[PDB]
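ENTRY TYPE: protein
WANTED: fold as tokens:
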Amino acid sequence: FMETQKLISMVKEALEKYQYPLTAKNIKVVIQKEHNVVLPTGSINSILYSNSELFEKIDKTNTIYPPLWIRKN
């Protein structure tokens, strides 16, 4: 587990607060103003893609890049 559950907790908190879809950079920058941390964006992508149960891309046609993400319904 280590510090990952912090990160998944942040990210949720970012998507909870801004009720439209977000890019992983959007989510990074939100996590950085709040909880005053400095994150790369790859660490968020790893979170986003490795937690299918929590997070999905809103566009399923592979047209939106960088992808927009939402809390799983």
Observations:
- The beta strands are 55-57, 69-71.
- Residues 4-17 form the longest helix (14 residues).
- The longest strand covers residues 55-57.
